[PDB]
């Protein structure tokens, strides 16, 4: 059965089982797995914050990204997160523009809120 033999996307050789295929449907054999760099895992919260991904970006866009549960955090392949982010945002440039818009909005809002509380303080103490 040809279906049962997976061509490795790294070495090009067929395999039947691997960590990456079992857990993530990533067709990469155990020989080619690079846990420290290419096939490193990241937390859901980290993936979401760093690459600006909504849950539906992970779960509803095709293919849905798979995760392993650690003990209770969901871990995703960074590689897949990054690919999904480029898909959703269109380009690295558009993602970088969004991250900059987000950081500037967040700073502006924190500053405004803090300053209003300082005013409220000075006003109440006065
Ligand atoms: Zn391989």
Curated annotation (Swiss-Prot):
Location of cross-link Glycyl lysine isopeptide (Lys-Gly) (interchain with G-Cter in SUMO2): 48
Consequence the record notes for mutating residue 11 to F: In XP-A; severe form
Residues modified as Phosphoserine: 91
Segments forming unnamed zinc fingers: 8-32
Assembly information from the UniProt record: Interacts with GPN1. Interacts with RPA1 and RPA2; the interaction is direct and associates XPA with the RPA complex. Interacts (via N-terminus) with CEP164 upon UV irradiation. Interacts with HERC2. During NER binds XPD/ERCC2 and XPB/ERCC3 of transcription factor IIH (TFIIH), bridging the 2 proteins.
Record family assignment: Belongs to the XPA family.
Disease: Xeroderma pigmentosum complementation group A: An autosomal recessive pigmentary skin disorder characterized by solar hypersensitivity of the skin, high predisposition for developing cancers on areas exposed to sunlight and, in some cases, neurological abnormalities. The skin develops marked freckling and other pigmentation abnormalities. XP-A patients show the most severe skin symptoms and progressive neurological disorders.
Function: Involved in DNA nucleotide excision repair (NER). Initiates repair by binding to damaged sites with various affinities, depending on the photoproduct and the transcriptional state of the region. Required for UV-induced CHEK1 phosphorylation and the recruitment of CEP164 to cyclobutane pyrimidine dimmers (CPD), sites of DNA damage after UV irradiation. During NER stimulates the 5'-3' helicase activity of XPD/ERCC2 and the DNA translocase activity of XPB/ERCC3.
The protein's name in its UniProt record: DNA repair protein complementing XP-A cells
Source organism of this protein record: Homo sapiens
Organism classification: Eukaryota, Metazoa, Chordata, Craniata, Vertebrata
Protein's gene: XPA
Portion of the parent chain present: 98 to 231 of 273
């Amino acid at each position: 059965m040809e279906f049962d033999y997976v061509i490795c996307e790294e070495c090009g050789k067929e395999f039947m089982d691997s960590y990456l295929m079992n857990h993530f449907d990533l067709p990469t054999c155990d020989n080619c797995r690079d846990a420290d760099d290419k096939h490193k895992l990241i937390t859901k919260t980290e993936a979401k914050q760093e690459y600006l991904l909504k849950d539906c970006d992970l779960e509803k866009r095709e293919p849905p990204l798979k995760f392993i549960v650690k003990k209770d955090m969901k871990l995703y392949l960074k590689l897949q997160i990054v690919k999904r982010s480029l898909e959703v945002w269109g380009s690295q440039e558009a993602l970088e523009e969004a991250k900059e818009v987000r950081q500037e909005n967040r700073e502006k809002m924190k500053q405004k809120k803090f300053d209003k509380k300082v005013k409220e303080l000075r006003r109440a103490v006065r």
